[PDB]
Ligand binder design. Structure first.
Ligand SMILES: *[C@@H]1O[C@H](CO)[C@@H](O[C@@H]2O[C@H](CO)[C@@H](O)[C@H](O)[C@H]2NC(C)=O)[C@H](O)[C@H]1NC(C)=O
Length: 849
């Protein structure tokens, strides 16, 4: 347009400069003053801008000086008697050309052209152009003139077009000089100085040297180590493959072209290089999106770990390739296109050129919204909510120091993930959007190379930031350069009567003793862990023996979950110093007295109490096909010796340490509650007549193996018939870790086909048998904790202490009887209305003699 004409012709200067005539000018052709003094020129500038510039101004202030000049130029023309009829006759493109003449020479200067202005009015475009070309004006600056003259002749912007537009390519350079040639056939060295091509060759070589091994090692090591093979890591493996396509297909070809200075492989090579570079980048993009989604759901909700198998991971990796091809395929298919970008040694999508045939307009918007903004929102939302959740969780437990340092590591890596994503895709998003809005303006080849730097650099630092920073991957990669617990490999539980059991450590310095594995949990109080620890004085000398009580909520795998930017949450933790003893135990138990006399002098007692806000020992049931999936709450009593002081728990010596799993179990209380009775009445929209139902049980509390009678009285006063009645025992498993989540899986059910007619009643008692044996080989069933691998029963109903301050975190189980009714629908026989009501009951272990 007019702005781009005069900006390129005159040139935009931020400071004051002398023009060809030698007069003080600033910005685009703005005369400050004719005064000879340099200070006088700055003074006339200062008043124009409105502040103390000191011969330096911005472009927006210069755009204001230009607008006042154009608004006044349209006047001086209309004011002039010779210029106005010409101005009125000529169209908007040729009017811009006339303003250029008046802007440069002035009102009196343009008035000297009589025959030129005459022929333009008469629509003689051929004769007026020769007139302007043979004049003094052309001889002075034929560079500027010829662009203005061609405008009069053609009536187009072809003269003021930004760069040479070929059919298969776009070069950001003017062919006015005539030096522009095809990037497929001839060298492009006229664009920038030849050393910058060898610079790119050195840069693209560096990305191959660094990129190929880093990404290849990710895949190579995972084949060797079976540990790394996990559904969650599948998305991180996709990132390695994604980055390899950029290196192999993209950077290797881009290297060879940057060697010679132009694109040797032709349009065929440009399509495939542009395809792989786009695909490899777009796969890498959505991999991090799916990774962000996967990390958000898996950690926050421990139930989802169970649900997340190979199928869900494959679904994530496939989705990536679908969205990747959504970006990469259409330029090949013809929507937009693949052309050489920047120095034209590297091919990429066409964001800068507006081509209406291939519709770059829709593709860039499609790119900006679908393939940029949506990944940006999701990643910032997922990792943003992820820190928000951990910040909330760490705020609850301020006592556990391990949960505090994790939150520190979480916030660290997320900020790095933000920075990694921002450095990569913002340059393209800024530039392509700027070019789309500012398309009238011109941009060089180096302008497009700056975003190309960062996205191609992401093939290096995204592997490092996402993979190398992860602890499980980092450790395995070290063992690869190293080219390669085993010594001891002994961890057994023994037993002797005097019934007591013990366990010896690996180094056999610290030996622990305990009374019983199952500790009875009452409502008011809890039965504490009682026992002793035999310490070897020779092996443990000048060291610190400790004992712990670890209540840990366990979900998923030890390796990958800890790698997952956080680790499994320790629910409760306690510590006591065993040796050397500080003071002594005020009162011992009958067990401790026996073991002290039985064992030698180096034995020391300990006692570990439980608070009232802890859950029971509960684990979720895995399916037979599910091997590595593991989730549940469990209690662990550990003992160890260490040189380091009390605070260090996360890191301890494995050889000195010894541990034994225990249970916290609730037996059924002596008081069986009142006879459960539920009652409800139901109606319809068309039919307003009532339907009464009354459920009744025998006991409030039931035992495992005990039959549950459900007495149901269906009183039918309505017009419809009841087809069948179904009773169901349903197991509510309320999981509280980062959030409260209710999950209902029916454990047992019985039904009957007895029909109930209108104005007729039926009383029926159906027995249900809630046993695990029938429910074996299922998913998500809550079970009582099993010592080792032994047979266990369905999870006991968890009783919470009345009136407590802290929220109970863990797996909280509850049962109820759902009496389901199937009634014939009013519209049709096939139509049906399922009605149901619930009543709670307890299922727990009996108290032994
Ligand atoms: C930029 O201008 C040059 C010089 O005019 C073009 O090169 C000529 O293109 C014409 C097209 O018909 C050929 O007939 C001539 O043989 C070419 N000249 C020479 C010396 O080879 C050039 O094609 C323009 N740029 C591009 C890339 O099209």
């Amino acid at each position: 347009n007019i702005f781009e004409m005069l900006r390129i012709d005159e040139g935009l200067r931020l400071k004051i400069y002398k023009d060809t005539e030698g007069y003080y000018t600033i910005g685009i052709g703005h005369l400050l003053t004719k005064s000879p003094s340099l200070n006088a020129a700055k003074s006339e500038l200062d008043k124009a801008i409105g502040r103390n510039t000191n011969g330096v101004i911005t472009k927006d202030e210069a755009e204001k000086l230009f607008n006042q000049d154009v608004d006044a130029a349209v006047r001086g023309i209309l004011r002039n008697a010779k210029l106005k009829p010409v101005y009125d006759s000529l169209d908007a493109v040729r009017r811009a050309a006339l303003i250029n003449m008046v802007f440069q020479m002035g009102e009196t200067g343009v008035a000297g052209f009589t025959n030129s202005l005459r022929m333009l009015q008469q629509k003689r475009w051929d004769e007026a152009a020769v007139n302007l070309a043979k004049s003094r004006w052309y001889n002075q600056t034929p560079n500027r003139a010829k662009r203005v003259i061609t405008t009069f002749r053609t009536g187009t912007w072809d003269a003021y077009m930004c760069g040479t537009e070929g059919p298969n390519f776009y070069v950001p350079f003017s062919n006015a000089t005539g030096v522009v040639r095809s990037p497929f056939e001839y060298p492009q060295y006229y664009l920038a100085e030849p050393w910058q091509f060898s610079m790119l060759a050195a840069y693209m070589f560096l990305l191959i040297v660094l990129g190929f091994p880093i990404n290849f090692l990710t895949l190579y090591v995972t084949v060797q180590h079976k540990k790394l093979r996990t559904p969650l890591n599948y998305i991180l493996l996709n990132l390695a493959v994604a980055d390899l396509f950029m290196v192999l297909g993209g950077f290797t070809s881009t290297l060879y072209t940057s060697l010679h200075g132009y694109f040797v492989f032709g349009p065929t090579g440009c399509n495939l290089q542009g395809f792989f570079a786009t695909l490899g980048g777009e796969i890498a993009l959505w991999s991090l999106v799916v990774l962000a989604i996967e990390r958000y759901v898996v950690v926050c909700k421990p139930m989802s770990n169970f649900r997340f198998g190979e199928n869900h991971a494959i679904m994530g990796v496939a989705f990536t390739w679908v969205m990747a091809l959504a970006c990469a395929a259409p330029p090949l298919a013809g929507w937009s296109r693949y052309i050489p970008e920047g120095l034209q040694c590297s091919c990429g999508i066409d964001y800068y050129t507006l081509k209406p045939e291939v519709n770059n307009e829709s593709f860039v918007i499609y790119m900006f919204v679908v393939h940029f903004t949506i990944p940006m929102i999701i990643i910032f939302f997922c990792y943003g909510q992820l820190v928000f959740t951990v910040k909330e969780a760490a705020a609850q437990q301020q006592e556990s120091a391990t949960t505090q340092k994790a939150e520190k590591e979480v916030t660290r890596m997320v900020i790095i993930y933000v920075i990694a994503f921002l450095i990569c895709w913002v340059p393209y998003a800024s530039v392509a959007f700027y070019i789309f809005t500012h398309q009238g303006s011109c941009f060089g080849p180096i302008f497009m190379t700056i975003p190309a730097f960062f996205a191609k650099s992401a093939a290096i630092y995204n592997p490092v930031i996402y993979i190398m920073m992860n602890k499980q991957f980092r450790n395995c990669m070290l063992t690869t350069i190293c080219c390669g617990d085993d010594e001891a490999s002994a961890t057994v539980s023994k037993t002797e009567t005097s019934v007591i059991f013990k366990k010896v450590s690996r180094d056999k310095s610290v030996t622990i003793y305990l009374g019983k594995r199952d500790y009875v949990d009452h409502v008011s109080q809890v039965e504490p862990v009682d026992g002793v620890v035999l310490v070897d004085p020779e092996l443990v000398k000048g060291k610190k023996v400790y004992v712990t009580l670890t209540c840990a909520f366990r979900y998923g795998q030890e390796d990958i979950d800890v790698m997952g930017l956080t680790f499994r949450r320790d629910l409760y933790f306690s510590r006591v110093q065993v040796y050397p003893p500080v003071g002594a135990m005020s009162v011992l138990t009958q067990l401790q007295e026996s073991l002290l006399k039985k064992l030698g002098d180096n034995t020391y007692p300990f006692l570990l109490t439980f608070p009232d806000y802890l859950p029971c020992s509960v684990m979720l049931q895995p399916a037979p096909q599910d091997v590595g999936k593991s989730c549940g709450v469990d209690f662990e009593v550990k003992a160890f010796a260490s040189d380091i002081t009390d605070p260090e728990e996360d890191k301890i010596p494995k050889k000195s340490s010894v541990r034994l799993l225990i249970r916290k179990v609730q037996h059924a209380p002596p008081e069986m509650g009142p006879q459960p009775s539920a009652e409800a009445s139901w109606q319809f929209f068309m039919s307003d007549k009532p339907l009464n139902l009354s459920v009744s049980l025998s006991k409030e509390i039931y035992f495992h193996g005990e039959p549950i009678p459900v007495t149901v009285t269906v009183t039918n006063n309505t017009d419809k018939v009841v087809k069948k009645i179904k009773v169901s025992v349903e197991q509510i498993a309320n999981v509280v870790l980062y959030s409260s989540d209710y999950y209902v899986k029916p454990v047992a059910s019985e039904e009957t086909q007895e029909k109930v007619q209108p104005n007729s009643t039926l009383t029926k008692t159906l027995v249900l048998v809630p046993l695990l044996a029938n429910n074996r080989e299922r998913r998500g069933i809550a079970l009582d904790g099993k010592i080792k691998h032994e047979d266990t029963n369905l999870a006991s109903s968890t009783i919470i202490k009345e009136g407590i301050d802290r929220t109970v975190m863990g797996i909280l189980v509850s049962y109820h009887i759902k009496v389901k009714l199937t009634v014939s629908g009013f519209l049709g026989e096939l139509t049906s209305s399922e009605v149901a009501t619930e009543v709670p009951f307890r299922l727990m272990h009996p108290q032994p003699e």
